[PDB]
Amino acid sequence: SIKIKNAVEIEKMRVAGRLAAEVLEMIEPHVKAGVTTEELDQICHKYITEVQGAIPAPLNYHGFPKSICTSINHIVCHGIPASEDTYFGQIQRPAVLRDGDILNIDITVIKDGYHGDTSKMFLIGDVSIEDKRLCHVAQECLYLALKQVKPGVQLGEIGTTIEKHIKTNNKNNPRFKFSIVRDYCGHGIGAEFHEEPQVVHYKNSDRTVLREGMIFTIEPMINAGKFGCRLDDEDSWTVYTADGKKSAQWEHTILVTATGCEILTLRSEESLPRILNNA
Ligand code: NA
């Protein structure tokens, strides 16, 4: 059943959302060539627990071995912080940032029983034009989906909007053609991490109607190659592009308002309004 948050729950979700954004703002100066994902995990864990008085959800509730997810390059999602680069057979399982890398840091914070879920891309040193375009177009996908959100809109319009943007990108930029990951989706979020509904990022005809008070994530994963993914069966978590090309993701937790949406995880650096009037 999809939850409609009451005024008290919305305020707690606003606090959780800001805390999750704050972690991403705090960590930025630590993100650079030669730092391990393990170090970033230690700094975030300590900040979340000691400064925010909050909980890292993945470590405590999801059976994740660390506090944050750190996905580099061809890792799509659920990269595991570590101190050393390892291998899944022939596939690199990176842990140490290099010039030219792209990194997603994925933060899920709980404060007073409510969740804030967000992620962003960081560009490490001099990143190629193709990697910049991938990160940029993935963020455009999130931002354009947000512009469609208001009461009465069918859920399928989110993925339909994202796929329309990627189709246009691919028609206009044959050198920088992208695909949408199909295996992972956004989701209702609140008192529980995984609530209804499921939010797919590709073209679909889901007729679920958005209502004021619903809270859910939009988190499109865009691949520089084909859409397919491969799960690390050794560590249970790491998801790779099946073709070894890079992948980028941006996520916000969002509240449906009377006329649009509120971006609970908005960061200070973003040129996106915290409250969109899409009416
Ligand atoms: Na990636």
Q: SS3 for the chain, per residue?
A: CCCCCCHHHHHHHHHHHHHHHHHHHHHHHHCCCCCEHHHHHHHHHHHHHHHCCCEEHHHHHCCCCCCCEEEECCEEECCCCCCCCEEECCEEECCECCCCCEEEEEEEEEECCEEEEEEEEEECCCCCHHHHHHHHHHHHHHHHHHCCCCCCCECHHHHHHHHHHHHHHHHHCCCCCCEECCCCCEEECCCCCCEEEEECCCCCCCCCECCCCCEEEECCEEECCCCCEEECCCCCCCEEECCCCCEEECEEEEEECCCEEEECCCCCCCCCCCEEECC
Q: 224 C-alpha to center of ligand 1: Å?
A: 10
Extract the annotated binding site for substrate.
Answer: 78, 194
Q: What b/e readout covers 143-172, taking b as 16+ CB neighbours within 10 angstroms?
A: bebbebbbbebebbbbbbbbbebbeebeee
Q: 100 C-alpha to center of ligand 1: Å?
A: 12
Cβ contacts of residue 75 below 8 Å, gap of 6+?
93, 94, 104, 238, 239, 240, 247
Containing domain of residue 138, as a range? 1-279
Q: 241 C-alpha to center of ligand 1: Å?
A: 8
Cβ contacts of residue 31 below 8 Å, gap of 6+?
40, 97, 103, 105, 122, 124
Q: 1 C-alpha to center of ligand 1: Å?
A: 32
Q: 3 C-alpha to center of ligand 1: Å?
A: 31
Cβ contacts of residue 126 below 8 Å, gap of 6+?
99, 100
Q: 104 C-alpha to center of ligand 1: Å?
A: 6
Q: 103 C-alpha to center of ligand 1: Å?
A: 6
Kindly give the pairing relationship between strand 260-263 and strand 275-277. antiparallel
Closest to 72 (Cα-Cα) out of 81, 64, 83: 81
Residue with tokens 């939010």: 199
For residue 268, the number of C-alpha atoms closer than 13 Å in the C-beta half-sphere is 7
Q: 86 C-alpha to center of ligand 1: Å?
A: 16
Overall resolution, Å:
1.9
Q: How far apart are CA 72 and CA 248, in angstroms?
A: 9
Q: What length is written for the chain?
A: 279
Q: How far apart are CA 111 and CA 16, in angstroms?
A: 5
Q: How far apart are CA 89 and CA 82, in angstroms?
A: 17
Torsion angles phi and psi, residue 89, rounded to 5: 55, -115
Cα distances from 241 to residues 36, 146, 165, in angstroms, run 22, 26, 21
Extract the annotated binding site for a divalent metal cation.
Answer: 106, 117, 187, 219, 251
Q: How far apart are CA 109 and CA 68, in angstroms?
A: 9
Q: In this structure, what CATH number is given to the domain that contains residue 239?
A: 3.90.230.10
Extract the annotated binding site.
Answer: 78, 106, 117, 187, 194, 219, 251
Two tokens, residue 149:
């959100």
Encoded amino acid at 236, one letter: S
Q: 35 C-alpha to center of ligand 1: Å?
A: 17
Residue with tokens 């008192």: 191
Closest to 229 (Cα-Cα) out of 245, 243, 242: 242
Residue 194 CB burial class (10 angstroms; 0-12, 13-18, ≥19): exposed
Q: How far apart are CA 100 and CA 98, in angstroms?
A: 6
Number of domains in the chain: 1
What technique determined this structure? X-ray
Closest to 38 (Cα-Cα) out of 3, 77, 85, 74: 85
Torsion angles phi and psi, residue 211, rounded to 5: -130, 150
